[PDB]
Backbone:
């Protein structure tokens, strides 16, 4: 249920701001950083919302005005779309599938141009949607460097050390409009998802529901995204989507969601909730142990399936031949 803001300021959000879907969910635990149950969840690679990390405490003052004045004059990747879904597509892989035409268009612009183009849309009451997704780098201004240095690195660095993870891969700044949706997908890295402004509904599915979410081919630009349209699921093509069960939560300013590697997640900015701001922390997972302990975890099988598809695309000399050969291997033999 919705949490209540301090000072009797009412519920931060209500159920009417959530989109409706066909599957059931149960809540992700919201725990304190000092709760041993939170440490045992991160250790067992299960999601958890940490409410009091102070991970991005200096950034909780961030808004469009503050950022525009201090985030520098670097280039920011801004995506536009006529729909609320911002399906990710790997541009490097668009050569393999010359028939894929993205629904989102990427435009590289300055931050003040992003704010202005967002102002125009609001002014003219247009229905275009924008989503800024840019990796933080050296080009940021002094005040943002101060904020960045003010994050609680003492806490997240200990997490990195306790779990044997690799190095921090990147920090992605996310600024989207109310109603924006990032369709279900899984990342190969560990992710700490630090909410700053606004509220986001996060629906996670464990790796063992691979069969229910039907990822695109590895060589397809939408590699690691689900093929299922959550708004209009095609049960004829994707019958096991009727068996999907998610883990749900709504994160607000100060909350940090641990999204374990290979876990699916569907993210949506709450309807009529204003703009959302997020910063995520990606870490390379711990190395694969030398002695493999059976039975294999679900994510290890996903890793195996990915490698088979990759090798097959390399050996055949064309990723388009992957499907035909795989079907030839199974039809009347393993099915
Ligand atoms: C883009 C982001 C989701 C979102 O907040 O829209 C995500 O996949 C991640 O941080 O891992
Ligand atoms: Zn992700």
Residues:
């Amino acid at each position: 249920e919705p949490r209540e803001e301090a000072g009797a300021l009412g519920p931060a959000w209500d159920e009417s701001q959530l989109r409706s879907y066909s599957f059931p969910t149960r809540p992700i635990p919201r725990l304190s950083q000092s709760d041993p149950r939170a440490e045992e969840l991160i250790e067992n690679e299960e999601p958890v919302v940490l409410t009091d990390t102070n991970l991005v405490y200096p950034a909780l003052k961030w808004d469009l005005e503050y950022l525009q004045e201090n985030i520098g004059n670097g280039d920011f990747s801004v995506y536009s779309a006529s729909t609320h879904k911002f399906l990710y597509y790997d541009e490097k892989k668009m050569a393999n599938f010359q028939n894929f035409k993205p629904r989102s268009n990427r435009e590289e612009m300055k931050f003040h141009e992003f704010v202005e183009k967002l102002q125009d849309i609001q002014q003219r009451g247009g229905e275009e949607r924008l989503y800024l997704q840019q990796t933080l780098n050296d080009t940021v201004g002094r005040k943002i460097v101060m904020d960045f240095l003010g994050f609680n690195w003492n806490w997240i660095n200990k997490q990195q050390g306790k779990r044997g993870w690799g190095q921090l891969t990147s920090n992605l700044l996310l600024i989207g409009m109310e109603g924006n949706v990032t369709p279900a997908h899984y990342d190969e890295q560990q992710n700490f998802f630090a909410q700053i402004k606004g509220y986001k509904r996060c629906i996670l599915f464990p790796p063992d529901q691979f069969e229910c979410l039907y990822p695109y081919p590895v060589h397809h630009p939408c590699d690691r995204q689900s093929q299922v349209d959550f708004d209009n699921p095609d049960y004829e093509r994707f019958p096991n989507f009727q068996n999907v069960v998610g883990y749900e939560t709504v994160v607000g300013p100060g909350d940090v969601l641990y999204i374990p590697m290979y876990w699916w997640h569907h993210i949506e900015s709450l309807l009529n909730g204003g703009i959302t701001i997020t910063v995520n922390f990606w870490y390379k997972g711990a190395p694969t142990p030398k002695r493999i302990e059976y039975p294999l975890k679900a994510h290890q099988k996903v890793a195996i399936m990915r490698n088979i598809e990759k090798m097959l695309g390399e050996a055949l000399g064309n990723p388009q031949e992957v499907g035909p050969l795989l079907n030839t291997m199974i039809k009347g033999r393993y099915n």
Remarks:
- The chain is about 25% helix and 25% strand.
- The first strand starts at residue 25 and ends at 27.
- Helices lie at 36-43, 64-70, 111-123, 142-149, 153-162, 210-213, 298-315, 322-330.
